[PDB]
Paper text:
Phytochromes are biliproteins of plants, bacteria and fungi that use red light as a source of information to regulate fundamental physiological processes, such as photosynthesis, seed germination, flowering and shade avoidance. The molecular architecture of phytochromes shares a common photosensory core module (PCM), which is composed of PAS (Per/Arnt/Sim), GAF (cGMP phosphodiesterase/adenyl cyclase/FhlA) and PHY (phytochrome-specific) domain4–6. Bacterial phytochromes can be grouped into prototypical and bathy phytochromes, in which the red-absorbing Pr and far-red-absorbing Pfr are the thermodynamically stable states, respectively. The conjugate Meta-F and Pfr crystal structures has been obtained from the engineered photoactivatable near-IR fluorescent protein (Agp2-PAiRFP2), derived from the bathy phytochrome Agp2 from Agrobacterium fabrum.
Here we describe the crystal structure of a Meta-F intermediate of the PCM of a bathy phytochrome at 2.16 Å resolution formed during the Pfr→Pr phototransformation. The intermediate has been generated by irradiating crystals of the parent Pfr state at ambient temperature and identified as Meta-F by resonance Raman (RR) spectroscopy. The asymmetric unit includes two molecules (Mol A and B), which differ in terms of the intermolecular interactions of their N-termini. Compared to the Pfr structure, the overall fold of the protein and specifically the α-helical segment of the tongue remained unchanged but significant structural changes were observed for the chromophore and its binding pocket as reflected by the ΔFo (FoMeta-F−FoPfr) electron density maps. The C-D methine bridge has undergone the expected E→Z isomerization as also shown by 2mFo-DFc and several types of omit electron density maps. The resulting ZZZssa stereochemistry of the chromophore structure exhibits a deviation of the tilt angle between neighbouring C and D pyrrole rings (38.9° and 44.5° for Mol A and Mol B, respectively). The first group includes a rearrangement of the extended hydrogen bond network surrounding the chromophore, most likely initiated by the almost 180° rotation of ring D and facilitated by conformational changes of the participating amino acid residues and movements of ordered water molecules. In the structure of the Meta-F sub-states of Mol A and Mol B, these Pr characteristic features including the concomitant re-positioning of Trp440 away from the sterically pressing Gln190 were not visible. Instead, the amino acid segments 439–448 in Mol A and 439–442 in Mol B were not resolved in the electron density map, indicating a disordering of the polypeptide backbone.
Author numbering:
A (entry chain A), C (entry chain A): 9 to 79, 84 to 119, 127 to 438, 449 to 506
B (entry chain A): 103 to 119, 127 to 408
């Protein structure tokens, strides 16, 4: 299936990747309940491991140390651990839904990386340098930052790549390309690896236990990924990947995504350094977003004050607005702005045609209810606006009188103007994803952000207030 | 005549029979929340002539605080006092989100029945939007006990929620005519808007100040070889970030305190507790004895 | 001819427009030397006026008042003057090359207009409101502001128009469309009127006097305009026009251009008010341009200081530059920036392809000579750059080491990516002009301004200085 994307239960595939092996034990780690088919090979054992004790399989020394490392469900990282045999492994150990999971890998980076981003003083400076830095440090052929839009669609906002590889920078992909359940998993596991997208996966034995339960591999780093995603990667010429969840204000802001054109695993010490880097990156981004929003609000307040200072020296507030209204484009990012006052229109930049305005103004008067009213899909509100979508597909309306239906109107252009296959078919390529996204946002503009709406409301109060203060001078006129 | 439709019944109310702009001019230049609210009680009392005018602000739990007051000299003051959430019940606060101006003409008057109270199909008359609606006898009795015979209140709406009330009390019966009510509602709407902007500017100033204070500390950290020593010398200055009565530093299993803090020897228990619930995040409570029973003693 | 545009001697057409009449007299205003053919009609006279005295033609009272108004070559404006007959005229009087020219028109605006622009606080705010204001006040169907680029090409930077008329906003036209000699005239006469582009012009008798001299009509408001321009207007559906020269720092910055779709004259009092408005507009624009440049330089100095403050806390200046270089895009408007250091490239935004950089860097090393070096036509310097012109057609290079050939490189995209007929043919339409301009700027980017170059030089010194200060730490590395 390729339509009901968010149904695939990716936390219980019944398979692991081939670069390690897995043992599942009970809560107390006494009995082996499950094992991956490759355990015998990597551990030097034979036959069915299930039913044997942890001590029989791994020895008392190792089992003792593993119990002691247990003490939410964040995996313990135990490098360079030895079995009774003498074979050496990096072991990841965790408990979830009262099953214990043991993963085996045969075997100042972070601080230095974080020093190179800590002084970034803007979001763009942070994200630009990070792809470049992650590529140099970890050696992946391509490193991207993929940012979630409010509807869940993704945008490639930074990129560093081998010169011969194609660029994805500035492209968008549909929400469905990283499904809902994938985004929930990535809220739990913050670092993920695919070692070989063409490798042969390793079954967990048994996939369903006697009581009908699958093995939940949510927190297992050896978890095998959806074959849909793996096929998407092979179509791109990508053989391996790593991604880091970027967590801002407790939500999934985006991903750092690394692609390699040949198979590639990161050792445990390298993964640990990279996770640590990702956590600092997340924190710094969060603070930088917050400072940017503050700067934006502070700037808007100062611009309102400058206008109000002019209003206090003018006898005719309407004339002042007719002369000044274009300057309100500084408050909120837009492609056009206009003023509807005394049933007359004045426009600046990209606005609907002059003669389409009275219909628009009647519409605004009927839904505003004396509040800010905004849409990024104007043709859904007014069917006839479809024709001028190329110039104005979004609108935000600010009442400027407590008494009359006068408004300041902000506009945005439709968003399109500011820009091998395997058995499952050509749906699984960036070209098709991008085309699907473009089609989905036709007749639509970039959504008005929360910041935009907070500024608008502050502006409403400023303008409604100064109008009331001038109201008897203006009736005198 | 006041006329409206609600739940598809029409209600007609009859009263036998630049104020707002001038009032609003006298508050529009307020540059702080305290300046706005202080002057407003004084101004509403002078303009509308009520014996007492209060501003009653809702706490986050719904309890109310009297934050401004203007009154006849002989009347008692309620300023700085708090009252339980239950004193203005949940359903009252919901009504006051719909009707923004309310009048009680005579708390000892004899009320007038609506005929019929329940119609043939079993429905009562919903008077949510009716200005002649009779008030709860519980509230009316509360007023009579205070020596209050009449009242008027204005809902203060900030960011679409009920921030508080402007509450006017008279010690004798009193009605506002329709033109006066209209002027006062208009005033209340501007008051609400200005308060909202002033709260928002105050919050911005507060955040901006905190960011600058952090930068000053970080600038010092960049010239010091020993960050722990710097923190031991400096930690009291972090009291500037967040209003508090005390602050302290728990580092390398040693405590340093400033101002009002738990006793020195109660700190290790507190620190063990914090270590077990923080999970590397900010953790806060306003009821410490609910988290640590032994904290009751130093409350 | 349509190729040697700047040859037409437009100051001596031998004709005037039909909405007035002209008399030419000697320096002392004793004898009539020339007259327009329509003088007899408008003045109520008969026969050949030439050779008669000023007093015989106009009467002693009028001639007396005209002599007294004479006292550089700026015309005297005498409204509501009467001939001996009793006919009433608005008279414009001036002397140039020792000929006296008398023009006759049968017959708080400025302050109020200027009050409505004086508080503009940006160039964009000034120019946007001015077209809107001039259209409302003077009633022309279209009012444009046309700004000269450094090469003399024009850009329509503001527009107000009847809704049904086409928009010219954002369009450019070749330098040749307003020829060199036209731009020189417009430096002398600041306000010009064409009353009727389809009207029949009125010959001056004689066009050439006995000694072989034409009548120089440079300062005459009744001067007939080039038939090339008049035909350009008719092709646009324009019957009348008025233009105001915008003079900034003693040069022709641009024009305010008004179009009417039917014949239209401004009376003398209205022209006087509009000239006055234009002078204030010019002055305010000049101050606003100067404040904008200051703000721009101040911002750049603060950004350099922020970077230098970081350099003072870092042991490795090269690493800092690799992490930070994208932030230098804030100094100078550009579409891309990059860093060439230790024979390695790092790019951001729109830059040449990675593998084209070493050739570019060799080129820069050979022409820089340790100075800022810039071009807006990169393929003229490096033929192979033609292929990547769409991404990078302009480059500015800043040396960042006194000793090594390391550079910071700024780039701009080619400019095309940031965007009836009469007997003389289709050359004379805005569509063809615009197409000619577009063709002329192929493979070219927006030129680096003087401000850009001043900032670059300040940046050079900052970066060369901090490199020298770090030079022994870096050799240690
Ligand atoms: C109908 C289902 C579809 C689908 C599902 C899917 N995607 C998943 C992971 C995932 N997708 C992407 C998308 C991209 N990566 C890219 O580099 C580009 C480039 C253009 C795109 C569009 C990413 C980054 C990820 C996460 C990768 C990671 O390493 O974490 C998953 C989950 C896979 C899992 O088992 O965790 C699913 C189920 N993708 C589709 O395109 C459709 C059709
Ligand atoms: C168990 C119920 C109780 C209760 C109910 C109640 N109160 C209501 C209105 C109301 N209460 C207050 C409280 C005060 N006013 C004061 O001046 C002071 C001074 C100290 C206090 C504590 C106010 C301001 C209001 C609103 C007044 C207004 O004019 O809008 C109502 C609703 C009344 C209605 O019909 O709208 C109810 C049901 N009050 C109690 O004290 C308890 C015991
Ligand atoms: C080969 C010569 C050509 C030419 C000559 C020419 N132009 C002149 C005046 C002039 N041109 C323009 C151009 C435009 N006006 C517009 O509205 C638009 C719209 C797209 C354009 C391109 C202007 C504004 C002016 C000045 C107008 C004014 O009123 O001052 C003149 C001088 C005319 C004179 O006698 O002063 C000349 C000689 N124009 C061409 O297009 C070519 C081919
Ligand atoms: Cl963001
Ligand atoms: Cl508050
Ligand atoms: Cl300019």
């Amino acid at each position: 299936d390729l339509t009901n994307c968010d149904r695939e239960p990716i936390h219980i595939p019944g398979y692991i990747q081939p670069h390690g092996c897995l043992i599942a034990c009970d809560n107390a780690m006494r009995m082996v309940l499950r094992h991956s088919e490759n355990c015998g090979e990597l551990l030097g054992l034979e036959g069915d491991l299930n039913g044997r004790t942890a001590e029989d399989v791994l020895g008392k020394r190792l089992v003792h140390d593993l119990r002691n490392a247990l003490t939410t469900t964040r995996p313990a990282m135990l490098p360079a651990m030895e079995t009774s045999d003498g074979r050496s492994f990096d072991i990841s150990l965790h408990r979830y839904k009262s099953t214990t999971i043991i993963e085996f890998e045969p075997s100042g980076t972070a601080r230095k990386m974080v020093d190179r981003i800590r002084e970034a003083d803007s979001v763009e400076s942070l994200i630009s340098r990070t792809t470049r830095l992650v590529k140099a440090t970890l050696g992946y052929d391509r490193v991207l930052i993929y940012r979630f839009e409010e509807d869940g669609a993704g945008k490639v906002v930074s990129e560093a790549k081998q010169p011969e590889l194609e660029s994805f920078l500035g492209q968008y992909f549909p929400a469905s390309d990283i499904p809902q359940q994938a985004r929930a998993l990535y809220l739990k596991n913050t670092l993920r690896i695919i070692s070989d997208a063409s490798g042969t996966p390793i079954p967990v034995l048994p996939a369903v236990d006697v009581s009908g339960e699958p093995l939940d591999l949510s927190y297992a780093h050896l978890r095998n990924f959806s074959p849909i995603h793996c096929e998407y990667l092979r179509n791109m010429g990508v053989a391996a990947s790593m991604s880091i969840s970027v967590i801002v204000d407790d939500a999934l802001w985006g991903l750092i995504v690394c692609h390699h054109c040949s198979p590639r695993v990161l050792s445990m010490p390298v993964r640990i350094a990279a996770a640590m880097f990702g956590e600092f990156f997340s924190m710094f981004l969060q603070v930088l977003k917050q400072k940017r929003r503050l700067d934006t609000i502070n700037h808007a307040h100062a611009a309102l004050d400058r206008f109000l200072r002019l209003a206090a020296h003018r006898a005719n507030l309407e004339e002042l607005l007719v002369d000044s209204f274009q300057d309100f484009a500084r408050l909120i990012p837009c492609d056009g702005v206009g003023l509807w006052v005394g049933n007359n229109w004045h426009g600046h930049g990209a606005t609907p045609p002059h003669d389409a305005i009275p219909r628009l103004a009647r519409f605004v008067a009927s839904v505003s209810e004396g509040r800010v009213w905004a849409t990024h899909a104007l043709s859904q509100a007014i069917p006839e606006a479809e024709i001028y979508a190329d110039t104005a597909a979004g609108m935000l309306a600010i009442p400027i009188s407590q008494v009359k239906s006068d408004y300041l109107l902000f506009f945005r252009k439709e968003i399109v103007q500011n820009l091998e296959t395997g058995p499952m078919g050509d749906r699984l390529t960036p070209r098709k994803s991008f085309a699907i996204w473009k089609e989905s946002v036709r007749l639509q503009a970039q959504p008005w952000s929360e910041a935009d709406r907070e500024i608008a409301e502050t502006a409403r109060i400023a303008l409604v207030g100064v109008a009331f203060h001038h109201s008897e001078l203006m009736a005198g006129l």
